[PDB]
Amino acid sequence: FGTNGFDIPTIAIALLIVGVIIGLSGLILSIFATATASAISNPSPGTLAYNLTHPLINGMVSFFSFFPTLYVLLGVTGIVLIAAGIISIIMEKF
Amino acid sequence: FGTNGFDIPTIAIALLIVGVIIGLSGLILSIFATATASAISNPSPGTLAYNLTHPLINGMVSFFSFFPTLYVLLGVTGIVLIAAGIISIIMEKF
Amino acid sequence: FGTNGFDIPTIAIALLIVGVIIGLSGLILSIFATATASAISNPSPGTLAYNLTHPLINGMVSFFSFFPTLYVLLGVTGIVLIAAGIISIIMEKF
Amino acid sequence: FGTNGFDIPTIAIALLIVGVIIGLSGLILSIFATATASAISNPSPGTLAYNLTHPLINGMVSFFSFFPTLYVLLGVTGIVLIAAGIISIIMEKF
Amino acid sequence: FGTNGFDIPTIAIALLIVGVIIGLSGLILSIFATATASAISNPSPGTLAYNLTHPLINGMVSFFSFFPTLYVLLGVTGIVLIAAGIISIIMEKF
Amino acid sequence: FGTNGFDIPTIAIALLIVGVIIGLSGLILSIFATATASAISNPSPGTLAYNLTHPLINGMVSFFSFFPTLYVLLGVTGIVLIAAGIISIIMEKF
Amino acid sequence: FGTNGFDIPTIAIALLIVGVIIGLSGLILSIFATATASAISNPSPGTLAYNLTHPLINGMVSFFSFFPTLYVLLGVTGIVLIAAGIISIIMEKF
């Protein structure tokens, strides 16, 4: 059901695969982040361990704050692909 | 029942296949999302685990919000295909 | 009973085939949709599972709303084919 | 049924083809415009996203406002063609 | 249905293609601009980040303000093409 | 849909490409400028580090102030291109 | 009584086999579940054994709740098979 490489069943299967992969990733990352939160403690505001540990958790927070826009762009890519397929169909179907 | 590559039975079979595939995908994704919702908890509004986990669920929500328009475009593609078939029939049947 | 490729018995057989195929497709899709409806539940209006699952069912509804016009166009194609056959007969029968 | 290249059956077939093509185009464009309207939101009158997005929808509106006169001219072309055929017939039929 | 290179069906198909392409472009640009607006924040009116970032968003706004007239001219081009076709038909049809 | 090298679909695609590229550039530059602002501190008004660092940030500010007019000229170029295309069409279409 | 591999007696025998197998499975699973229920006790709501044992019975309940839809899909498969047989008969019997 297509012309050269655009197949609606294949597209649906690919959407299924990407959805389930993203679900697994979210699940695993959340489960791991819970354990990470449990393991690290807060020693004190101003002793040696605080100076040693604070920037690490700051980097954690920053990278995880970068995740959302990555996911948004990844979602945007699919609309581009489907639109390209539609244009390719229209170009030489007539 | 056609001219070159347009076959009404083949089109009907393809519609059947895409419908059942989309049904399976929705079923599986919903069943998995229920388990994902059950697994992750809400620790607290302001502790370490919240900072570690919130953007992940935000990305989840965003991508899943992108799904509907993908499905709509995928549906639109079929009308284009059938119309192209009709035009191809009319062009050289006469 | 024809001239080159237009055969009334063949056309009748093709109509039989397309009718039975469409009947099977409707039957199978309805039976599957019942199971799909039974499987998915409605967790709550505003918790995590709702955000995770709502757009999926929205895409389901949209695609299935696209089905009717696909069927209508598929039906229209046959009238075009039969008319083309009539014209081809008239052109060189005289 | 003609003299050199003017054939009334051919003209009727061409009218059929152009009519069905224009119908398909209107159908597809309307269906797509509905999805486009659904996808884009209105963030606020005066924030960054408004400044970023408003001229795009303005260009959309302008081009789609240009469509009608294009269709009108396209319709006018056929009368010219048929009249040219009539004149060509009259010129050397006598 | 034409004389040398002017074909009404071809013109209709070209109009379809340009319309759908412009629709896709508007959709994609709007979706991306939403994410762009979400990503960038407003640090403060007078600190280093403001001086570093303000002219960039100014350039964004300016270019996107240039888009509308580009679209208008692009729309105008088609009327010229169709009129040229009409004149070419009239010139040697008689 | 054109004469020699002017193609309305190609122009629309080029506009899409330039728009998305400019959006990416703005996004990346803003995200990087935030990190740059965070990294550099303000030691004191009159010590060695101030003398060592102030002209660098001055050069930063100046170049980024030059960006807007670059973007404006880049936008202006497209109107010239489209107008040249219109003139080229009109010249030998008649 | 068939064409290539579709045999009505064979289909009836297969239906018999699947029915009796499903009956045996239900019987055995129910008989075993009774013994399982009898063996495990409920120590107390909050002591060590409760924490040690509760999630196990939760997993039991969940998997056994998944069984029904598995059976429903297994039932649906047969209608597909019989319909495929009917179509295969009709295709080349005429």
Short mmCIF file of C-alpha atoms in Angstrom, two decimals, chain D residues 10-11 14-15 17-18 21-22 24-26 28-29 32 35-36 39-41 43 48-53 55-60 62-64 66-67 69-71 73-74 76-78 80-85 87-88 91, chain E residues 1-3 6 8-13 15-16 18-20 22-27 29-31 33-34 36-37 40 42 57 60-61 64-68 71-76 78-79 82-83 85-86 89-90 93-94:
data_model
loop_
_atom_site.label_atom_id
_atom_site.label_comp_id
_atom_site.label_asym_id
_atom_site.label_seq_id
_atom_site.Cartn_x
_atom_site.Cartn_y
_atom_site.Cartn_z
CA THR D 10 -12.45 14.22 -25.96
CA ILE D 11 -13.60 17.63 -24.72
CA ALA D 14 -11.35 16.50 -20.37
CA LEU D 15 -14.11 18.39 -18.58
CA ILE D 17 -11.12 14.98 -15.59
CA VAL D 18 -10.69 18.63 -14.60
CA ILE D 21 -9.36 16.81 -10.05
CA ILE D 22 -10.65 20.11 -8.67
CA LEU D 24 -10.23 16.08 -5.02
CA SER D 25 -8.06 19.15 -4.47
CA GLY D 26 -10.75 20.99 -2.55
CA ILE D 28 -7.86 17.28 0.45
CA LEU D 29 -7.05 20.92 1.17
CA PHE D 32 -5.73 19.23 5.80
CA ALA D 35 -5.92 19.45 11.03
CA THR D 36 -3.71 22.53 10.67
CA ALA D 39 -2.70 21.71 15.74
CA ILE D 40 -1.75 25.38 16.16
CA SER D 41 -2.90 27.14 19.34
CA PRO D 43 -0.52 31.35 23.12
CA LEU D 48 7.27 35.62 22.47
CA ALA D 49 5.33 32.82 20.77
CA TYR D 50 2.83 35.31 19.36
CA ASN D 51 5.59 37.38 17.76
CA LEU D 52 7.14 34.16 16.47
CA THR D 53 3.96 32.69 14.97
CA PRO D 55 3.12 36.35 10.45
CA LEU D 56 3.10 32.69 9.42
CA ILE D 57 -0.67 32.41 9.80
CA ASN D 58 -0.96 35.78 8.07
CA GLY D 59 0.86 34.37 5.05
CA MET D 60 -1.35 31.29 5.16
CA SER D 62 -3.14 35.62 2.23
CA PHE D 63 -2.19 32.77 -0.11
CA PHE D 64 -5.47 30.98 0.50
CA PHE D 66 -5.39 34.27 -3.61
CA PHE D 67 -6.77 30.83 -4.55
CA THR D 69 -9.16 34.15 -8.60
CA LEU D 70 -6.78 31.41 -9.73
CA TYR D 71 -9.75 29.06 -9.94
CA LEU D 73 -9.12 32.19 -14.44
CA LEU D 74 -8.68 28.43 -14.78
CA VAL D 76 -12.26 31.02 -18.01
CA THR D 77 -9.57 29.21 -20.02
CA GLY D 78 -11.99 26.48 -21.14
CA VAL D 80 -11.52 30.25 -24.82
CA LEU D 81 -10.53 26.75 -25.90
CA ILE D 82 -14.05 25.76 -26.97
CA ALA D 83 -14.54 29.02 -28.86
CA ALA D 84 -11.24 28.52 -30.68
CA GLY D 85 -12.47 25.08 -31.67
CA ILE D 87 -13.90 29.08 -35.08
CA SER D 88 -11.48 26.48 -36.43
CA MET D 91 -13.11 28.36 -41.01
CA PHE E 1 -6.39 19.66 -23.10
CA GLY E 2 -4.10 22.41 -24.31
CA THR E 3 -1.81 23.49 -27.12
CA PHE E 6 -0.42 24.58 -21.05
CA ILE E 8 -5.46 22.59 -17.26
CA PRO E 9 -5.18 19.27 -15.34
CA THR E 10 -1.46 19.89 -14.85
CA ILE E 11 -2.18 23.40 -13.57
CA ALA E 12 -4.76 22.07 -11.11
CA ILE E 13 -2.30 19.44 -9.87
CA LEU E 15 -2.03 24.25 -7.42
CA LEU E 16 -2.78 21.24 -5.23
CA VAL E 18 1.78 24.21 -3.79
CA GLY E 19 -1.19 24.47 -1.43
CA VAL E 20 -0.30 21.33 0.48
CA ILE E 22 2.52 25.73 2.08
CA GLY E 23 0.21 24.09 4.61
CA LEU E 24 2.94 21.71 5.74
CA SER E 25 5.42 24.58 6.03
CA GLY E 26 3.09 26.66 8.17
CA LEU E 27 2.29 23.69 10.39
CA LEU E 29 7.12 26.30 11.52
CA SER E 30 4.36 26.99 14.04
CA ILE E 31 5.03 23.75 15.92
CA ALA E 33 8.19 28.14 17.10
CA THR E 34 6.14 26.94 20.07
CA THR E 36 11.49 27.67 20.63
CA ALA E 37 9.35 30.01 22.72
CA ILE E 40 14.22 30.38 25.85
CA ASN E 42 13.80 35.94 30.04
CA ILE E 57 15.29 37.24 19.30
CA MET E 60 14.06 36.15 14.77
CA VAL E 61 11.16 38.58 14.94
CA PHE E 64 9.50 36.17 10.54
CA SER E 65 7.96 39.57 9.87
CA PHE E 66 9.47 39.41 6.39
CA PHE E 67 7.71 36.09 5.64
CA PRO E 68 4.21 37.51 4.80
CA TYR E 71 4.08 34.55 0.59
CA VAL E 72 2.08 37.31 -1.11
CA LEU E 73 4.54 37.58 -4.01
CA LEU E 74 4.61 33.80 -4.32
CA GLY E 75 0.83 33.87 -4.65
CA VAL E 76 0.97 36.66 -7.24
CA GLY E 78 0.54 32.09 -10.30
CA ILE E 79 -1.83 34.68 -11.76
CA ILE E 82 -2.13 31.51 -15.90
CA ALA E 83 -2.52 34.79 -17.78
CA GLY E 85 -1.08 30.66 -20.71
CA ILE E 86 -4.33 32.33 -21.75
CA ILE E 89 -3.64 30.00 -26.28
CA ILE E 90 -5.37 32.98 -27.90
CA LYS E 93 -5.54 29.11 -31.63
CA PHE E 94 -6.98 31.49 -34.25
#
